[PDB]
Amino acid sequence: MSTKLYGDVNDDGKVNSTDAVALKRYVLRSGISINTDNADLNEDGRVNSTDLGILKRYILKEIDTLPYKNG
Ligand SMILES: [Ca+2]
Numbered sequence: 001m002s003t004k005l006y007g008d009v010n011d012d013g014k015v016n017s018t019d020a021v022a023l024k025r026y027v028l029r030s031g032i033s034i035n036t037d038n039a040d041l042n043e044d045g046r047v048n049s050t051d052l053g054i055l056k057r058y059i060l061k062e063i064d065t066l067p068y069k070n071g
């Protein structure tokens, strides 16, 4: 029907400061349940700090493609 997300945490929109709640709970331990499927995209898990940026960069609105920018 319709799909638009990128490594969502609570399947709300995406994994960012918004889904930090679970993040903190995650970074701490792997107890909570999140769409770990496509959650991590830098072998970090979520947004250690390197991904966050881009995330908070694209998640700003670009949320749809995400300028991963390889390099
Ligand atoms: Ca979300």
Ligand SMILES: [Ca+2]
Residues within 6 Å of the ligand: 040, 041, 042, 043, 044, 045, 046, 047, 048, 051
């Ligand atoms: Ca990551």
